[PDB]
Amino acid sequence: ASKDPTTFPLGCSPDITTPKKGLSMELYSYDFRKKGSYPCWDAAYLDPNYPRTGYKSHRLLAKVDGVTGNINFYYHATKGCTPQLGHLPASYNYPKPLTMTNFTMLLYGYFRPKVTGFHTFTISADDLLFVNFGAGNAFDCCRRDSSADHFGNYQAYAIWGSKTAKDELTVHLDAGVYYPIRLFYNNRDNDGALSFTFKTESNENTVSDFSEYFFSLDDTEEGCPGLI
Numbered sequence: 001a002s003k004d005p006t007t008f009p010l011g012c013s014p015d016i017t018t019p020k021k022g023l024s025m026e027l028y029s030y031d032f033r034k035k036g037s038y039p040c041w042d043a044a045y046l047d048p049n050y051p052r053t054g055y056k057s058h059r060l061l062a063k064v065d066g067v068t069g070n071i072n073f074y075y076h077a078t079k080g081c082t083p084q085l086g087h088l089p090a091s092y093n094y095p096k097p098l099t100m101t102n103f104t105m106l107l108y109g110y111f112r113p114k115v116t117g118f119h120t121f122t123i124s125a126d127d128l129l130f131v132n133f134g135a136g137n138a139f140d141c142c143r144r145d146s147s148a149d150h151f152g153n154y155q156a157y158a159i160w161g162s163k164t165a166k167d168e169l170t171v172h173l174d175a176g177v178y179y180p181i182r183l184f185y186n187n188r189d190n191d192g193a194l195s196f197t198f199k200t201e202s203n204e205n206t207v208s209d210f211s212e213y214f215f216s217l218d219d220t221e222e223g224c225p226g227l228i
């Protein structure tokens, strides 16, 4: 598993144990700066090591399993520079309020395609969504705990305030293979939004519901490298 982003990512072949539905999620706090700061929001989220080590210094809010379905959301704040409560969609399996104006979220697991061929994932975010995809690039097959912090350059990323807060990733995938995926999200202030969808060459359907696509696999002693 090379770490570089590629159009032909490497996947994984789990053994006997049934993959579990959904991704894992970790939620962390992301404070504003002190009252009166200009701007009110902290730019820590754009430190190059924020998605790797920096987020870990912040308060851990939750770690949940089973995140699947439609993971898209749009949180409307009533004003900026203010921590405001909200809720993630039911898909996130987290039924507590959080400061939806200002938080960090990590999702990881595997993407299992239904078709063999080119997939184009489209992402957008307010404020930030960084995507790694493929063995090595995201993490190693059934060896996530050992490789989790060694993800490579992003396959796709979106940052609000850029020319477009939108990006795409086009990758050729094999049906029924399990591809490591890592989604890293932040809201710095005010509204928050995440959109993650895809299309394939097989038809003109847009997938927004990942119920049959996102899975979690236990790490194993020997890992589970792609056998196809």
Ligand SMILES: OC[C@H]1O[C@@H](O[C@@H]2[C@@H](O)[C@@H](O)O[C@H](CO)[C@H]2O)[C@H](O)[C@@H](O)[C@H]1O
Pocket (backbone or CB within 6 Å): 041, 080, 126, 127, 160, 188, 189, 190, 191, 192
């Ligand atoms: O529009 C979403 C965007 O809002 C940002 O807050 C903005 C701020 O950048 C500036 O334009 O002022 C307005 C109102 O005073 C405020 O909406 C926020 O920092 C971003 O993260 C986005 O949510």
Ligand SMILES: [Ca+2]
Pocket (backbone or CB within 6 Å): 126, 127, 187, 188, 189, 190, 191, 192
């Ligand atoms: Ca925002």
